[PDB]
Amino acid sequence: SERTFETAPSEIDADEVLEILSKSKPAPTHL
């Protein structure tokens, strides 16, 4: 079973990025 649809990306500010990443720690990308 499969599905697909499109979603427009919203603009993210610098302070938005900082707000998120200030709480976050690195995670594995490629395992």
Partner 1 sequence: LPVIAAPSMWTRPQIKDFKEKIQQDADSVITVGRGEVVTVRVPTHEEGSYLFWEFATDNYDIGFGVYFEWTPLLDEIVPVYRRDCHEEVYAGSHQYPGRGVYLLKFDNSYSLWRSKSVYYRVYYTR
Amino acid at 25: K
Q: Min. distance of Cβ 18 from partner 1 in angstroms?
A: 12
Min. distance of Cβ 22 from partner 1 in angstroms? 9
Contact residues toward partner 1 (CB under 8 A) are 1-12, 16-17, 20-21, 23-31
Whole-angstrom Cα distance, residue 31 to residue 14?
Answer: 28
Tokens of 26: 């690195």
Amino acid at residue number 9: P
